[PDB]
Amino acid sequence: LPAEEELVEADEAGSVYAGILSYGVGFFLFILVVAAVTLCRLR
Amino acid sequence: LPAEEELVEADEAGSVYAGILSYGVGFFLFILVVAAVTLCRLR
């Protein structure tokens, strides 16, 4: 019962740097809905 | 599910992924000055 050679995958700049994206992306979405409403209501 | 995540010292997402950050970060700065002014001028 030999073992079949199985490839491996390493994690790099995936879930590490992504933590910083939440700031730009997260703020983008929140700003889109926030600015849109605040701006629309200002009209 | 034998597979799992891991962290190691390496260089990645140098000037490649950074291109996507410009969207979040860039919009953040532009939104800060834009929203601030638009909001301030509101009242």
Swiss-Prot record, chains A, B:
Protein name: Fibroblast growth factor receptor 3
Effect annotated for changing G14C: In KERSEB, BLC, keratinocytic non-epidermolytic nevus and TD1
Transmembrane annotation, as ranges: 20-40
Disease: Achondroplasia: A frequent form of short-limb dwarfism. It is characterized by a long, narrow trunk, short extremities, particularly in the proximal (rhizomelic) segments, a large head with frontal bossing, hypoplasia of the midface and a trident configuration of the hands. ACH is an autosomal dominant disease. Crouzon syndrome with acanthosis nigricans: Classic Crouzon disease which is caused by mutations in the FGFR2 gene is characterized by craniosynostosis (premature fusion of the skull sutures), and facial hypoplasia. Crouzon syndrome with acanthosis nigricans (a skin disorder characterized by pigmentation anomalies), CAN, is considered to be an independent disorder from classic Crouzon syndrome.
Residues of the full protein shown: 357 to 399 of 806
Function recorded in the entry: Tyrosine-protein kinase that acts as a cell-surface receptor for fibroblast growth factors and plays an essential role in the regulation of cell proliferation, differentiation and apoptosis. Plays an essential role in the regulation of chondrocyte differentiation, proliferation and apoptosis, and is required for normal skeleton development. Regulates both osteogenesis and postnatal bone mineralization by osteoblasts. Promotes apoptosis in chondrocytes, but can also promote cancer cell proliferation. Required for normal development of the inner ear. Phosphorylates PLCG1, CBL and FRS2.
Record remark: domains: The second and third Ig-like domains directly interact with fibroblast growth factors (FGF) and heparan sulfate proteoglycans.
Lineage: Eukaryota, Metazoa, Chordata, Craniata, Vertebrata
Tissue specificity as recorded in UniProt: Expressed in brain, kidney and testis. Very low or no expression in spleen, heart, and muscle. In 20- to 22-week old fetuses it is expressed at high level in kidney, lung, small intestine and brain, and to a lower degree in spleen, liver, and muscle. Isoform 2 is detected in epithelial cells. Isoform 1 is not detected in epithelial cells. Isoform 1 and isoform 2 are detected in fibroblastic cells.
Subunit architecture: Monomer. Homodimer after ligand binding. Interacts with FGF1, FGF2, FGF4, FGF6; FGF8, FGF9, FGF10, FGF17, FGF18, FGF19, FGF20 and FGF23 (in vitro). Interacts with KLB. Affinity for fibroblast growth factors (FGFs) is increased by heparan sulfate glycosaminoglycans that function as coreceptors. Likewise, KLB increases the affinity for FGF19 and FGF21. Interacts with PIK3R1, PLCG1, SOCS1 and SOCS3. Isoform 3 forms disulfide-linked dimers.
Modification comment: Autophosphorylated. Binding of FGF family members together with heparan sulfate proteoglycan or heparin promotes receptor dimerization and autophosphorylation on tyrosine residues. Autophosphorylation occurs in trans between the two FGFR molecules present in the dimer. Ubiquitinated. Is rapidly ubiquitinated after ligand binding and autophosphorylation, leading to receptor internalization and degradation. Subject to both proteasomal and lysosomal degradation.
Family: Belongs to the protein kinase superfamily. Tyr protein kinase family. Fibroblast growth factor receptor subfamily.
